[PDB]
């Protein structure tokens, strides 16, 4: 009676890695795919200053994303209770010879 319940991915592929960075006091970093369902992202605060081509010495906002693709997946499905099926075999002696084993 097998109804699929939930599937897990155990091997994946990554593609289209990109990052967007912001100087301090210029707000939050932004990528157009950061709100995409198929993309995985992470925001962080990096050190920025004159070495990085920025006017002030402070914590800059950095977001990076990439597209996630599942390569191989496993599936957990439902066992409907009260929906089993046993199979039994019965064999009778006397007339039979062991070719019937």
């Amino acid at each position, epitope marked *: 009676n097998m109804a699929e319940v939930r599937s897990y991915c155990y091997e994946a592929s990554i593609s289209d890695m990109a990052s967007d960075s912001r100087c301090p006091t210029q707000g939050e970093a932004y990528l157009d795919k950061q709100s995409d*369902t198929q*993309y995985v992202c992470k925001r962080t605060l990096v050190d920025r200053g004159w070495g990085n081509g920025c006017g002030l010495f402070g914590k800059g906002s950095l977001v990076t994303c990439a597209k996630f693709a599942c390569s191989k997946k496993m599936t957990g499905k439902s066992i409907q209770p009260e929906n089993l099926e046993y199979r039994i075999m019965l064999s009778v002696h006397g007339s039979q010879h062991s070719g019937m084993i």
Partner: antibody
Amino acid sequence: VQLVESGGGLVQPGGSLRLSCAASGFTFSSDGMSWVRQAPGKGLEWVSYISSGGATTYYADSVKGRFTISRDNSKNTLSLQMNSLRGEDTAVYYCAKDITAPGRNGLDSWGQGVVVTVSS
Amino acid sequence: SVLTQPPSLSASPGASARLPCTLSSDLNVGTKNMYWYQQKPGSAPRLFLYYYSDSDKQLGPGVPNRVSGSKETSSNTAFLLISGLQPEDEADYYCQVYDNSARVFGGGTRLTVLG
């Protein structure tokens, strides 16, 4: 999908106008909306955005502090309050669906716009 | 953030139209959602094409298959493509990007189908 604007006309510098747009053909309360202006003979420039629920509003630097965008999701109406109007604000004002989708945005549908003329 | 388009372009019917939109080094074209809007004289703009890549795109309602998009990272440019040009395709076209509450429009290209 129907976007019908109204509430425009001739205003004088330092006055105020209040634009209204009735929306139909879609679930209005589930989409963000934006106003876009186009001066006579020139290109397009975004004015202001408001989210579906109204919690978040954004304004262009040329309009900040002077304009205010509003929603009435029960009446399916988008409002744009314009204060301290100057001669730069003379343009056609378009009402547009500013949607949010999985990894996708955009001005899907536009109204035909209303004329706003600021002159002394 | 500046979007740069040529003021005007022209071609004959049956042509493969190619309309550029230069992104300033502020952003990078490869990571941008591209929204093209078509506006014919006397009418409002309509959403013509959404384009992130050849695998992430959508044509506007009633926009034929001949309309396509592309990018080139070397020149930080986006392109609007119209195969087999037709008189009805003569219009004004604007590229547009989103950037953290900022909606930036290009100058706009006025496409002219020659007749």
